[PDB]
């Protein structure tokens, strides 16, 4: 049972058919505008549900969440513990993506700010202790309180600060990392974390059980404290539609695989599959799950043996 | 009777409490409001509020109901808004920083259907308007509107504004000839001269008046013979949001001209409406207070000019 904390949002996604090239008053004429369900916690919960996992969504939304709830619940997500603001609206992510998958975005937190009032003790009380708590991009204070609560209650947690790393300070990031069963970042975020925390690579590795560093088209690295390193290349894409939510999908597929008892490499291969499915669609939860297509692409990228091992648990 | 053609939209306006000075830009914003917008909507709203007879001529989606009720409640004739069967109203998405710098993206949507609007139908229904504003719109719609104005003998104001970036030289040239007014800002004026290959005198020989807004330095009104009037801004008490300030200036100026005011008095009224828009979030969220208008006009331009302006409202 995975508890997913983080932002719940509506993503307003636009497509610019050009290349961001301005060199202030930028204006981009866009040829596509879609509104989809989003937020890192929503994306990851959706993906874990679709893949058949036991998952609860733990975040702060406004009252408009009804339809979103019905969507998530239809894929097995426990939405009981979504905090609903009576006054604030759900967070909104507004993003314009160009031909090269470069993004210009703005994020309005709104109801997300109230996530600091959520107590994991209540979720535990209601559902028992989850096997993993994902501390995703959220209200910063909510992130700290969730992490501290996980440490006090003995809950294994995955640090997934993601977009909020830019906002947070060194002391803040440091307070987020110690004791994590997983640390998730991309490579640029990994460099930024090392810089801001003042930690060396070995400083971080001595405080976590596993580092997962996504590398975009170069795949993903999984590094154990002793230096054991697994590199998993991407599932090659047939199109680059929109990069929004690709990292969330990788994390969700990877942690679903781990929850199904798969090894590190097999879990990362499954995560790579879900990631490419998200890369090839517009929106973070618009991707479809086709069992046979999944088997086929997994086998093409990683071999029939790995594909069979992966699909056997889904 | 002023006919306003141009974009009808919903403006999604955000505020970045920082300074745009940071590819993967990400801005954490502390305000998000959704307001009624589009250049034609803004100008029609302003002309209605100020008591003018105005018709809105643009393309919207089906959600336009509430917007229509609003505009009509301020006296705007919305009969000739074309309503798309499938497309939603255009959306303008903008993030503004402390210095009023903007990073925006514009989705035309239903606006593209404005090319199917015939000004002849509007004329038929309401008679010949005293002025047609060719605001930022579907480019082909802009050309067809301008040509129709020339064909029917309708005086028109060239107001390409945001679309100048999209359009080409020949296109811009096609928009200008015969205009009773040419509206741009100073940067847009330079860009127009560059892209069209025209000199200043080339343009002035084809229009009756050039109006070039200069942001904080006010506005210039240049006649073909070189007669030039400069009108400073109405000084602001706050820089809230720059969206729609130019539309408000144009609307106040052309309302003044329709009320028989001179060029300078009309530009002073336009400066007032412009500052009212600058001091609020959204393009049509500003209120009209007669006494506050008189007082600020008198403070900026003298009691005489203020009395002359308010006498017609
Ligand atoms: O994974 C994609 C999902 O993320 C969801 N989302 C997209 N942004 C976010 C954020 C965030 C942020 C941020 C913080 C600070 C600055 C900043 C400001 C000023 C100066 C420097 C930095 C900028 C941006 N937080 C939570 N979820 C997000 C989206 O809803 C989408 O579905
Ligand atoms: O006056 C404010 C009102 O304008 C309304 N609006 C805000 N934009 C627009 C536009 C436009 C544009 C444009 C064209 C071309 C490029 C471009 C692309 C690629 C490369 C170079 C340039 C970008 C942007 N058109 C009509 N109304 C607008 C808003 O609804 C608001 O209320
Ligand atoms: Na996507
Ligand atoms: Na404004």
UniProtKB/Swiss-Prot annotation, chain B:
Residues that bind ATP: 185, 213-218, 246
Keywords: ATP-binding, Kinase, Magnesium, Nucleotide-binding, Purine salvage, Transferase
Pathway in which the depicted protein is active: Purine metabolism; AMP biosynthesis via salvage pathway; AMP from adenosine: step 1/1
Residue positions of the active site: 247 (proton acceptor)
Activity across pH: Optimum pH is 8-11. Activity decreases rapidly at values above pH 11 and below pH 8. Is inactive at pH 4.3.
EC number: 2.7.1.20
Keyword DNA damage: no
PROSITE patterns linked: PFKB_KINASES_1 (PS00583)
GO biological process, one term: AMP salvage
GO MF term set: adenosine kinase activity; ATP binding
SUPFAM superfamilies: Ribokinase-like
Catalytic activity from the UniProt record: adenosine + ATP = AMP + ADP + H(+); adenosine + GTP = GDP + AMP + H(+); dGTP + adenosine = dGDP + AMP + H(+)
Gene3D superfamilies given in the database record: 3.40.1190.20
Binding positions (substrate): 7, 11, 26, 38, 42, 92, 106, 162-163, 247
Requisite cofactors: Mg(2+)
Regulation: The enzyme is subject to substrate inhibition by adenosine and is competitively inhibited by the adenosine analog iodotubercidin. Unlike other adenosine kinases it is not stimulated by inorganic phosphate. Activity is stimulated in the presence of potassium, resulting in a 13- and 300-fold increase in the catalytic efficiency with adenosine and methyl-Ado as substrate, respectively; the stimulatory effects are not observed in the presence of NaCl or LiCl.
Primary role: Catalyzes the phosphorylation of adenosine to adenosine monophosphate (AMP). Can also catalyze the phosphorylation of the adenosine analog 2-methyladenosine (methyl-Ado) to methyl-AMP, the first step in the metabolism of this compound to an active form that displays antitubercular activity. Is not active on guanosine, inosine, deoxyadenosine, cytidine, uridine, or thymidine. Prefers dGTP and GTP to ATP as phosphate donors in vitro.
Quaternary context: Homodimer.
PANTHER family, per the entry: ADENOSINE KINASE, HEXOKINASE FAMILY MEMBER
Family the entry assigns: Belongs to the carbohydrate kinase PfkB family.
Protein name (record): Adenosine kinase
